[PDB]
Amino acid sequence: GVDSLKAAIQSRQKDRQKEMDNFLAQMEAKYSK
Amino acid sequence: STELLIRKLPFQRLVREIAQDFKTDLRFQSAAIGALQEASEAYLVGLFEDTNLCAIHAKRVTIMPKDIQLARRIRGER
Amino acid sequence: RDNIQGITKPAIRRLARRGGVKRISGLIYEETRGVLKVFLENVIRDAVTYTEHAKRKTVTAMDVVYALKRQGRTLY
Amino acid sequence: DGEELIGDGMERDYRAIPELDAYEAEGLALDDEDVEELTASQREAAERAMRQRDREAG
């Protein structure tokens, strides 16, 4: 139902935020002082 | 060549047009545009994945704007 | 300057396919352009704000990094 | 109804176009001049300003 849909999207968004954190860390390692 | 999503030149010109409304005579580092493009494409692809899940929950294969809107509300955007 | 048209219908289809979508309504194109527009407006506004506080006229990769960090905390 | 994304002619969406497949020089930084990283206090001042900006916008 809608609860399952909601849990799946929120779970994906958590993983996407971690992927973005990792991408921004790689950008810092390449471009930051 | 299924690595292609948004072409680089139109994306760059889009970014510069939007930025002009906030400050005049900006330049961009190449990697600043690249990072904006990576973030934008990751955002849209993920939104289409979530939109697709909304459509499927509605027993549909064709995603519609109401599916995008539902996904964004579940994601806490608006 | 109508550069939102650089987000072409093929580009939108390429993004949808990568997201696993199989069929789209015709109204998906304009909805996608609008969603990308606001996303970019929000991140670029923050990025240029960092640029201004750095007292320069070049948006750097790090300005964008901090704008994306901030967006992760405010977009949702 | 809708539009099938996987079907005849899908290859037309994946053409290579060198004139559009790279960033152009116009509007890009070409000298590595005046690109110093935000200092800690400049970042904090920007974020305080944006925090007030967001709170006022509601």
Author numbering:
A (entry chain H): 212 to 244
B (entry chain A): 57 to 134
C (entry chain B): 23 to 98
D (entry chain C): 68 to 125
Sentences from the study reporting this entry:
From biosynthesis to assembly into nucleosomes, histones are handed through a cascade of histone chaperones, which shield histones from non-specific interactions. Using structure-guided and functional proteomics, we identify and characterize a histone chaperone function of DNAJC9, a heat shock co-chaperone that promotes HSP70-mediated catalysis. We show that DNAJC9 recruits HSP70-type enzymes via its J domain to fold histone H3-H4 substrates: upstream in the histone supply chain, during replication- and transcription-coupled nucleosome assembly, and to clean up spurious interactions. With its dual functionality, DNAJC9 integrates ATP-resourced protein folding into the histone supply pathway to resolve aberrant intermediates throughout the dynamic lives of histones.
The αB helix also forms a steric clash with ASF1A/B (English et al., 2006; Natsume et al., 2007), which implies that the binding of DNAJC9 and ASF1A/B to H3-H4 dimer are mutually exclusive. Moreover, the residues Gly212, Val213, Leu216, Ile220, and Gln224 of αB are bound in a consecutive channel constituted of Asp106, Leu109, Cys110, and His113 in H3.3 α2 helix; Ala127, Ile130, and Arg131 in H3.3 α3 helix; as well as Tyr98 in the H4 C terminus. Notably, Arg223 and Arg227 of αB establish prominent polar interactions with Glu105 and Asp106 in H3.3 α2 helix. Furthermore, the residues Met231, Phe234, Leu235, Met238, and Tyr242 of αB are bound into another consecutive channel constituted of Ala87, Ala91, Glu94, and Ala95 of H3.3 α2 helix, as well as Ala83, Met84, Val87, Leu90, and Lys91 of H4 α3 helix. Interestingly, DNAJC9 HBD αB has a similar structural configuration to the αA helix of CENPA-specific chaperone HJURP (Hu et al., 2011), though they share no significant sequence similarity.
